[PDB]
Design an enzyme around this catalytic site. Structure first.
Site, mmCIF file in Angstrom:
data_model
loop_
_atom_site.group_PDB
_atom_site.id
_atom_site.type_symbol
_atom_site.label_atom_id
_atom_site.label_comp_id
_atom_site.label_asym_id
_atom_site.label_seq_id
_atom_site.Cartn_x
_atom_site.Cartn_y
_atom_site.Cartn_z
ATOM 1 C CD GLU A 702 -3.262 -0.830 1.824
ATOM 2 O OE1 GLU A 702 -3.393 0.290 2.357
ATOM 3 O OE2 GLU A 702 -4.179 -1.681 1.789
ATOM 4 C CG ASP A 703 -0.205 4.556 -1.225
ATOM 5 O OD1 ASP A 703 -0.404 4.277 -2.426
ATOM 6 O OD2 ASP A 703 -1.053 5.137 -0.511
ATOM 7 C CB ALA A 704 5.327 0.499 0.840
#
Ligand SMILES: Nc1ncnc2c1ncn2[C@@H]1O[C@H](COP(=O)(O)OP(=O)(O)OP(=O)(O)O)C[C@H]1O
Ligand SMILES: [Mg+2]
Ligand SMILES: [Zn+2]
Lengths: 739, 149, 54, 298, 99, 99, 422, 125
Positions: A702-704
């Site tokens: 997640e968005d990492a």
RNA sequence: CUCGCUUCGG
């Protein structure tokens, strides 16, 4: 600092006390001078802004004045007498940084790319945000909580602000004001203002059948009472009058006189009565009644969020109000000291020079700018958060904060409408740039190509309008207002008159403005629904340049742009030759604008100079912003306000409380023209990384994102954090000191 | 209102038929299509918007209200109810949006943002009230739910 | 309808004299006896919708 | 789910009209148990669900119709002998709307809460002509009270429930049969149920207070459950029926529908400390001190 | 999020660094996709940025082409070092003896 | 949470009773389903749905080596003490392939 | 669209310049006129013009209520006072019309009498709006107040002689604060008293049906010939526009209009400073065809030098002696020497190598770039080329100026060879 | 009543009828002239300063254009507000310092407005 | 330290 302060001083040039007449203190001329420091013992010394930053002092200039007064009935004059200190805006006319070369900037330890425009007080950089507020002296038709369609006008002059209302609570119209115990019928007010015949009142309201049907109950209510003369209505109003907490001094049980004074002065202040002749005020209130009646049918309720009714107050107007208040307080204190000293002391005649305290103005200015809270008792204005600490996270941070606009309503509550993006923001305000959070939509940013108008003299506008066939309102009865082809012409909320064939008047006014005989920021617009021609000349209005289009061909040709590139002509030359003209929001409501040349049709009056000027400064950093979803653009504006990078060329000598620098900043590979215009590439705030878009190791769910260890080992993303630790060693009242 | 409904229907027809065409012509192993099929992220509507054609921009479930007099923007004619002048965005995200379409899209985005901003506070207060009222109850050992008293 | 006094311009009301119904002004001796029929229709809006839907 | 609800629009429930508050405002109105709610809806079932004429007849019976809505013209005639208001009923529109209204029905509608217009003042001349002759009341009233009547004579109710504002003929387009129901944007359930031709056994309402006061506390509980579940479903998010059933039982366990506001919470709970902590701390604490109310720690 | 602008920016940056130019991503304009695709094919790379890639771990080629290119990434001031917080018994407030 | 800078709080109970109550009542394994409707909340998410969908597609066919590597990817932690139980191959005559 | 018809002459008459008033009744429709109503009086004030008409209304007409007339006549006056009675009889017989002054100045308004082929204009001395005044109600209220005082005195049938001796309440003439004096001056009562100080003037009424009306109607005309050239009204359209719109009172700040207002030498200097490379023909076009070429040549020879037939602004003009390089801060003399070297190289050859200039002048790269950008463009594989083409026409037309610049360049070349050791 | 125009106004005033008419025209603030030996300054030049005789011509062009050639310049004449109330042009002549005469000259029906043709004045120079 | 104010983050 070059015009307004002289006007304020001229308004308050002579001060005298009632006790001991023939004594006076007269101001002759006022000067602000160049910035200086009072560190040297009774000696000034030129000071750079960076020195004020380092020493945690204020960057100010001495407010001096030359005066003439009377000590012992002998006139004594001073040619240069300091009275205060003005905090000096950087890069202003008096600022030392103006008109300097980058080498001279380096000698003064200031970045040549610094936007300036901010004050330095006690070592901190404060910026006065541009305030947004509803325009004054304008009729606003709005629904109430109960759904009743009423009217309100906030008549504000240089002295008094009063919002008077009109209600239809029981099918009949009442006028409500803060100075009246109870709202009174409008017909009684009409009778009090000189016009006594009911037929004349009905003629003024309108001759349409439904208008008489709606206004009949008010006439019946008036006839139920025995009010038929001006004296009776004045007596009724005086009965409905409330004393202002036992006003000292009584001029013969005043009542009728109180009512007449309230009608002449307090009610509808912006509408002037020449000498107790309420004809113009009668016409104004009749127009207001007619608008209420018409809006009571088809629900054409005006919206507050329309930016044609919005005005922007810059730092100049706020500082003018503050200096007027402070100078009035200073003069009042001087007069009170004169009263306390002159009539009792001695043959040693009292003279003001021994009592003119100089810390009043300086302390007021410094406290108001630093704390940011402004309390003007003369205007009953209590504002907060006027000034904010300039953010030095990055060059883009400061540049975008320099062009911010605060709203008159605050994130204090969940409002609806202002928070929305109105279409009126086109070309004026950045659509994407808004703070993501509680203040979403209440803090806005100016577009790249926009201009805020100042105040004009308002004389030649009246002269031209009178010469253009506008009939005087006093010459005709109100029935002419109801004619289908008769158009009212206003001027800053005042009825300038009536006119037939408004197309000729509007075309002639625009042609005169293009020719140069009228100031280019004077706006003229037409409202066909209300049949009102508005002429706006007050300051604070948003304007935007547009290329004039005449018969499907732009006034700007390739040869003109070639001359501009070669330096033969500048933008002012385009303005004077009727090629580019400024459009106000109200004026652009009536114009037809083509985005591109291929969009130009027969009915096109203007051409867009450049569409990408619609976006603001922060939103200019986005490459291909039209290919993204708008929330991404807003997030990027917010993110990039917080981007880490270089601040300026003097970032090493500068000592701030918190500073973030990038070890090896790089200019972007895909740069917008806005980046070139603001010279962002000279102070980059990021690095170009070889990004590969793929899923790897499941550590980027997640968005990492996954970083390369070798890249970080080779200096990618390397950053520097500078913090400040300051201490003070002060000498106390007792002759002992910190060591 | 009948005209508004018919125009919205026609614009939706254009949008959904363009989406169907783009989905039909799309090949397999197309990563947006793969992520839409398994449902991990996105949907067919997002693919159609960012490939084929963005739909009509809706504010409060309707076309763009006229900010100016009888028109949304000065760039369009007065009393013009054409699809392009009231919020429809013929261009797709790949092709890029013209300034009017971009402005309408930003209007929709800001509407969503302010909606979320108000919703957070309203539901926070409602949650506080509901919990402060309901927290006393407990399922007893005789299978009867009883209050604190 | 709304009628106004030709003398002073104030609103005219309807009253009864010694012979006939007359328009009269509240602030001056002006009157006007009614000779023939005088009417003021309004034609209020009729409910036109049949209200079938779905 | 309140956080999850988007507060959407265009959820017209199949009628493309009749704006009904759905979402967080709807849940807040339901849990507040306010006596008067915004946009109240009453669903009425017809004895003859297949006939449109019967549906319009019962709609006209229940829907309030003003005098000005049916009269084609109202004229104030000042004859030399007398002055009076003449109202002409448009019988064509009366039969088109199928209203059971004649001249005598209008006459009986008059003389009800109109400055006490005496029955002798109102008269009928033709089949669709009504003559009103007002007289001075002597209480700041003269004959030129005509205008007052001109202000409100069109605004008198001739047929229908005064509280009912507007009723619409909704149709279910079931493949087996197209059946007709009434959607009433009014706030009088008892009157709607009592009207002829309406199957009052199967008529519901949105206002939980009206349902409670009309049909008992259990009907109020069922209405609360159905309304909360329907509102939650409209946003596509599901809640187990046990939670909403428990909430409804708590709202209606003292015999009266009590809201989740501070007033209902004060009537429900007894512990002083919780009442003080929730809202109105000082008032609750001072009242408890005055009453000497010993509070347990249950 | 439908951020096609990022993909176009990556492609334009790859083309620009390949031919030593600075492409423009100006709003409602800028360099079109066709020109940067022609520049990429002229320079010997794939006309859509997707490149054949060998897995670093297994040493075998990947089944799908990978989208490579230079993107202008910016670091934000929010750091874990500044935000990391841990609290022992610590100090308390005088009025109410709480942390 | 979305790993975009979100900060999370972490409390350490200081009592055996509190620790046991936390482990039993609030264990992650004990709250896999939300109480609102019983739906499972802790489940696979992006890059797990996509990875599994690509893995279970009918196109996939693994030899012994790749299948062994993918299976051995899970043999860590408490799964270090179990026999692998490699399933029999699906297609075996022309080539030995595991779906 | 030619003036096909009705070439009407316009005459002016000053016979009734100061005697002409316009009376408009805002409440009387034009169909109903006051021709048949017998007028009784007209009061007027010459200064602060305020005319009050006093007319008579009949009573025997059916449109008059004699009962209400008797009642109002009793209300306004006493029972049989008649010493100052607003109505002579016992019925409301007189009506009062009061005038309101619409505007202060009426010079822009004129009354036009139209006759066959001519229009006669006459200025208006004033314009007033006549409205039916309600003044008998104020007098009725005053008489009601005095009747109330009588009623108060009538509580006792016989009133004892009051010892209400007016105690000497002679008030201090308090020295009024100037603010309060200004307030009193601006008070409505003060203005009304000042208006009332002017005496009233009585006037008889002569109606439209009077023969005197037609007699004095002829004064609106003027005796004059049909065709006369007016001595006045001869101002040009530019002069008229100036009259009706009187005036209120980077280095390229000045506009083109401001430039054209400046002397020719300053115009040439500013144009050379802004452009720094431009042909002579373009200068003639920009300055204007009305300026002689010799003067322009003289002016440009003092602020510019000839390179390849074009004119380049002198280095000292761009860099004043007090100025310095914005990039390096070097004194302006070095910048002048470097730019002179660049211009000399351009005279010698059309192409200039940037590295050679940097080596010879020992200057930084950005200063050399600034020097070159002012007069050159980058041509790939060829270096820097002069921005403008070789202009042989100007060289052919003015060989003497070519020789002047030739020996000037010879001297400058000698100086540069001395300085840079070429 | 339909809104009439100046060309039709004068055309019916002269062709359809020969009866004289009283008009009320509003002139611009300053006329295109100079105060003739009025002791001045570019001040206002009104009708009070001009002398008797012909001062200008009235031109009626095609397509209804109505101009007033007042010398070198030409103004344009348009209809004013259509007044419907009574307007009486009267002459108040104070022949004596104690007694004066009011002479009802006639009735005023239509109003004219004269304005400078600014477009011509601008394109001229 | 207390308090307020702003700017952030989410
Ligand atoms: N005021 C707030 N109250 C509660 N949570 C908040 C608040 N502001 C941010 N958050 C946290 O951040 C998350 C909001 O993210 P969300 O709105 O779902 O995506 P987003 O910010 O729209 O990103 P995109 O714009 O969709 O890329 C959810 C919430 O836990
Ligand atoms: Mg987050
Ligand atoms: Zn009257």
């Amino acid at each position: 600092i070059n015009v307004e302060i002289k006007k304020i001083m001229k308004a308050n040039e002579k001060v005298t006390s009632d006790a001991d007449p023939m004594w006076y203190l007269k101001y002759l001329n006022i000067y602000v001078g160049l910035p200086d420091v009072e560190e040297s013992f009774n000696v000034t010394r030129p000071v750079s802004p960076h020195e004020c930053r380092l020493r945690d002092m204020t960057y100010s200039a001495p407010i001096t004045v030359d005066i003439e007064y009377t000590r012992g009935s002998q006139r004594i004059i001073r040619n240069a007498l300091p009275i205060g200190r003005m905090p000096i805006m950087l890069r202003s006319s008096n600022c030392v940084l103006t008109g300097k070369t980058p080498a001279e900037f380096a000698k003064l330890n200031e970045c040549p790319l610094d936007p300036g425009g901010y004050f330095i007080v006690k070592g901190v950089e404060k910026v006065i945000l541009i305030q947004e507020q509803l325009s004054k002296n304008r009729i606003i038709v709005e629904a109430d909580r109960k759904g009743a369609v009423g009217a309100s006008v906030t008549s504000s002059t240089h002295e008094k602000k009063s919002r008077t209302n009109m209600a239809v609570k029981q099918g009949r119209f009442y006028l409500r004001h803060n100075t009246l115990s109870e709202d009174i019928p409008i017909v009684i007010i009409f009778k009090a203002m000189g016009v006594e015949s009911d037929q004349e009142i009905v003629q003024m309201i309108g001759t349409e059948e439904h208008v008489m049907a709606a206004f009949g109950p008010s006439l019946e209510e008036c006839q139920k009472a025995q009010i038929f003369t001006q004296m009776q209505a004045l007596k009724y109003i005086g009965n409905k009058v409330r004393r202002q907490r036992m006003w000292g001094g009584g001029p013969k049980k005043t009542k009728i006189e109180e009512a007449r004074e309230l009608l002449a002065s307090t009610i509808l202040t912006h509408v002037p009565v020449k000498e107790f002749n309420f004809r113009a005020k009668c016409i104004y209130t009749a127009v207001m009644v007619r608008r209420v009646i018409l809006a009571q049918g088809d629900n054409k309720v005006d919206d507050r969020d329309y930016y044609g009714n919005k005005r922007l107050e810059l730092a100049g107007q706020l500082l003018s109000l503050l200096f007027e208040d402070l100078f009035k307080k200073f003069n009042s204190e001087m007069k009170k000291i004169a009263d306390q000293v002159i009539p009792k002391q001695r043959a040693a005649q009292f003279d003001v020079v021994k009592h003119m305290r100089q810390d009043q103005i300086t302390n007021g200015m410094v406290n108001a700018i630093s704390t940011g809270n402004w309390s003007l008792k003369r205007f009953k204005m209590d504002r907060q958060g006027v000034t904010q600490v300039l953010s030095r996270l990055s060059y883009i941070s400061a540049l975008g904060m320099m062009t911010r606009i605060s709203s008159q309503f605050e994130k204090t509550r969940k409002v609806s409408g202002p928070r929305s993006l109105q279409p009126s923001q086109w070309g004026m305000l950045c659509p994407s740039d808004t703070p993501e959070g509680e203040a979403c939509g209440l803090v806005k940013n100016l577009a790249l190509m926009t201009h805020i108008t100042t105040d004009m003299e308002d004389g030649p506008i009246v002269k031209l309008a009178s010469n253009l066939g506008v009939e005087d309102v006093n010459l005709l009865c109100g029935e002419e207002l109801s004619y289908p082809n008769v158009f009212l012409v206003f001027l800053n909320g005042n009825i300038l008159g009536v006119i037939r064939d408004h197309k000729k008047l509007v075309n002639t006014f625009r042609l005169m403005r293009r020719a140069g005989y009228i100031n280019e920021f004077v706006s003229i617009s037409t409202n066909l629904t209300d049949r009102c021609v508005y002429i706006s000349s007050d300051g604070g209005r948003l304007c935007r340049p547009y290329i004039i289009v005449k018969k499907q061909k732009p006034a700007v040709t390739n040869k003109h742009m070639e001359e501009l590139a070669q330096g033969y002509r500048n933008f002012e030359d385009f303005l004077h030759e009727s090629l580019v003209e400024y459009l106000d929001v109200n004026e652009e409501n009536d114009c037809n604008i083509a985005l591109y040349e291929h969009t130009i049709n027969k009915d096109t009056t203007h051409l867009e100079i450049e569409p990408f000027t619609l976006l603001g400064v922060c939103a200019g950093l986005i490459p291909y912003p039209h290919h993204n979803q708008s929330p991404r653009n807003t997030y990027q504006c917010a993110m990039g306000k917080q981007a880490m990078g270089t601040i300026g060329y003097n970032q090493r000598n500068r000592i701030d409380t918190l500073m973030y620098l990038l070890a090896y900043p790089q200019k972007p590979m895909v740069k917008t023209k806005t980046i070139e215009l603001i010279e962002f590439e000279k102070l980059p705030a990021g690095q170009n990384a070889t990004v590969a878009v793929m899923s790897y190791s499941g550590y980027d769910i997640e968005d990492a994102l996954v970083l390369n260890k070798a890249s970080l080992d080779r200096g990618f993303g390397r950053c520097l954090v500078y913090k400040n630790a300051k201490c003070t060693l002060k000498r106390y009242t007792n002759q002992t000191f910190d060591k | 209102e009948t005209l508004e409904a018919l125009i919205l229907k026609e614009l939706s027809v254009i949008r959904d038929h363009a989406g169907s065409a783009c989905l039909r012509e799309l090949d397999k192993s197309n990563s947006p299509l793969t992520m839409a099929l398994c449902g991990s992220k996105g949907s067919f509507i997002n693919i159609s918007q960012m490939i084929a054609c963005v739909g009509q921009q809706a504010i409060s479930g309707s076309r763009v209200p006229d900010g100016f007099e009888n028109r949304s923007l000065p760039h369009f004619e007065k009393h013009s109810k054409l699809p392009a002048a009231k919020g429809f965005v013929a261009n797709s995200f790949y092709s890029g949006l013209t300034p009017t379409e971009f402005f309408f899209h930003t209007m929709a985005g800001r509407e969503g943002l302010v909606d979320t901003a108000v919703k957070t506070a309203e539901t926070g207060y409602m949650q506080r009230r509901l919990v402060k009222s309901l927290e006393d109850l407990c399922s007893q050992y005789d299978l009867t739910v009883r209050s604190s008293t | 309808m709304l009628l106004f006094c030709p003398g002073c311009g104030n609103g005219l009301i309807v009253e009864e004299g010694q012979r006939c119904h007359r328009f009269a002004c509240n602030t001056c001796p002006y009157v006007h006896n009614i000779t023939r029929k005088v009417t003021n229709r309004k034609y209020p809006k009729l409910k036109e919708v049949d209200d079938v839907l779905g | 789910p309140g956080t999850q609800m988007t507060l959407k629009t265009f959820h017209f429930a199949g009628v493309a009209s009749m704006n009904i508050t759905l979402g967080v405002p709807r849940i807040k109105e339901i849990i507040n148990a306010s006596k008067a709610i915004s946009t109240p809806i009453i669903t009425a079932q017809l004895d003859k669900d297949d006939d449109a004429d019967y549906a319009r007849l019962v709609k006209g019976r229940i829907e309030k119709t003003l005098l000005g809505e049916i009269s084609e013209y109202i004229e104030e005639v000042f004859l030399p002998d007398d002055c009076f208001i003449l109202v002409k009923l448009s019988l064509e529109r009366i039969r088109l709307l199928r209203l059971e209204v004649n001249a005598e029905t209008v006459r009986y509608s008059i003389c009800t809460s109109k400055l006490r217009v005496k029955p002798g003042d109102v008269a009928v001349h033709g089949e669709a002509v009504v003559c009103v002759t007002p007289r001075e009341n002597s209480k700041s009233s003269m004959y030129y009270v005509l205008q007052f009547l001109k202000e409100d004579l069109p605004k008198v109710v001739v047929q229908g429930i005064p509280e009912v504002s507007r009723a619409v003929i909704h149709i279910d387009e079931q493949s087996g049969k197209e059946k007709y129901k009434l959607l009433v944007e009014g706030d009088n359930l008892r009157a709607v149920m009592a009207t002829h031709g309406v199957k009052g056994t199967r008529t519901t309402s949105n206002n939980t207070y009206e349902v409670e006061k009309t049909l008992g506390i259990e009907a109020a509980r069922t209405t609360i459950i159905n309304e909360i579940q329907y509102t939650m479903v409209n946003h596509g998010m599901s809640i187990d029926r046990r939670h909403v059933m428990l909430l409804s039982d708590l709202m209606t366990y003292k015999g009266e529908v009590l809201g989740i506001t501070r007033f209902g919470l004060a009537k429900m709970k007894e512990s002083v400390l919780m009442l003080a902590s929730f809202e109105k701390t000082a008032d609750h604490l001072f009242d408890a001190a005055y009453f000497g109310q010993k509070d347990s720690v249950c | 999020r439908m951020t096609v602008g990022k993909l176009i920016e990556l492609l334009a940056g790859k083309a620009g660094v390949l031919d030593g130019r600075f492409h423009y991503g100006t709003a409602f304009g800028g360099s079109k996709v066709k020109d940067v695709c022609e520049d990429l094919v002229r320079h010997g790379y794939n006309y859509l940025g997707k490149d054949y890639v060998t897995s670093g771990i297994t040493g075998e080629p990947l089944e799908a082409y990978i989208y490579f290119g230079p993107v202008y990434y910016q670091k934000l001031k929010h750091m874990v070092l500044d935000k990391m917080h841990a609290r022992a018994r610590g100090p308390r407030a005088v009025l109410t003896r709480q942390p | 949470a979305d790993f975009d800078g979100d900060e999370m709080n972490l409390h350490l109970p200081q009592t055996e009773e509190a620790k046991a109550e936390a482990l039993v009542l609030m264990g992650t394994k004990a709250n896999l389903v939300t109480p609102r409707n019983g739906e499972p909340l802790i489940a696979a998410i992006q890059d797990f749905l996509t990875g599994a969908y690509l893995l279970t597609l009918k196109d996939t066919f693994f030899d012994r080596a790749k299948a062994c590597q993918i299976i051995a990817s899970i043999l860590v932690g408490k799964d270090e003490k179990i026999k692998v139980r490699l399933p029999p191959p699906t297609i075996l005559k022309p080539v030995t392939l595991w779906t | 669209d030619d003036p096909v018809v009705q070439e009407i002459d316009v005459y002016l008459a000053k016979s009734l310049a100061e005697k002409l008033y316009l009376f408009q009744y805002p409440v009387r429709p034009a169909s109903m006129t006051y021709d048949d109503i017998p007028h009784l009086s007209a009061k007027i004030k010459p200064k602060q013009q305020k005319v009050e008409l006093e007319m008579a209304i009949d009573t025997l007409n059916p449109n008059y209520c004699r009962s209400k007339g008797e009642q109002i006549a009793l209300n306004v006056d006493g029972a049989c006072a008649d010493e100052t009675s607003t109505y002579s009889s016992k019925l409301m017989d007189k009506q009062t019309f009061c005038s309101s002054q619409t505007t202060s100045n009426t010079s822009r308004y004129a009354a036009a009498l139209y006759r066959q082929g001519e229009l006669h204009l006459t200025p208006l001395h004033g314009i007033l709006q006549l409205r039916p005044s309600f003044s008998y109600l104020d007098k009725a209220d005053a008489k009601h107040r005095e009747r109330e005082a009588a009623n108060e005195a009538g509580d006792s049938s016989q009133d004892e002689a009051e010892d209400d001796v007016k105690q000497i309440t002679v008030r201090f003439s308090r020295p009024e604060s100037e603010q309060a004096r200004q307030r009193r001056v601006q008070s409505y009562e003060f203005l009304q008293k000042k208006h009332a100080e002017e005496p009233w003037v009585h006037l008889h009424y002569y109606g439209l049906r009077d023969s005197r009306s037609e007699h004095e109607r002829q004064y609106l005309l003027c005796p004059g010939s049909s065709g006369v050239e007016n001595t006045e009204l001869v101002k040009s359209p530019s002069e008229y526009l100036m009259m009706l719109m009187p005036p209120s009172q980077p280095s390229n700040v000045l506009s083109m209009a401001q430039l054209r207002t400046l002397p020719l030498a300053d115009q040439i200097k500013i144009l050379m400073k802004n452009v720094k490379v431009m042909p002579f023909a373009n200068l003639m076009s920009l300055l204007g065809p009305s300026i002689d070429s010799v003067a322009v040549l003289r002016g440009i020879q003092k602020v510019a030098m000839l390179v390849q037939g074009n004119w380049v602004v002198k280095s000292d003009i761009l860099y004043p002696k007090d100025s310095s390089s914005p990039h390096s801060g070097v004194p302006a003399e070095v910048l002048c020497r470097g730019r002179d070297f660049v211009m000399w190289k351009f005279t010698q050859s059309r192409w200039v190598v940037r590295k050679e200039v940097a080596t010879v002048t020992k200057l930084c790269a950005e200063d050399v770039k600034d020097f070159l950008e002012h007069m050159a463009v980058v041509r790939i594989n060829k270096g820097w080329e002069f921005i403008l083409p070789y202009d042989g026409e100007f060289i052919k037309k003015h060989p003497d100026v070519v020789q002047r610049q030739h020996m000037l360049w010879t001297g400058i070349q000698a100086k540069l060879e001395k300085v840079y050791n070429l | 009543l339909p809104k009439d125009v100046s060309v039709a106004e004068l055309l019916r005033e002269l062709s359809l009828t020969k009866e004289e008419e009283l008009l009320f025209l509003q002139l611009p603030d300053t006329l295109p002239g100079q105060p003739p030996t009025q002791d001045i300054a570019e001040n206002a030049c009104t009708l009070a300063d001009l002398t008797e005789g012909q001062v200008g011509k009235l031109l009626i062009r095609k397509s209804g254009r109505v101009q007033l050639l007042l010398g070198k310049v030409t103004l344009d004449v348009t209809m004013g507000t259509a007044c419907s109330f009574l307007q009486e042009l009267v002459s108040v002549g104070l022949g004596d310092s104690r007694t004066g005469e009011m002479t009802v000259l006639g009735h005023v029906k239509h109003k004219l407005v004269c304005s400078p043709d600014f477009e011509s004045l601008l394109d001229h120079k």
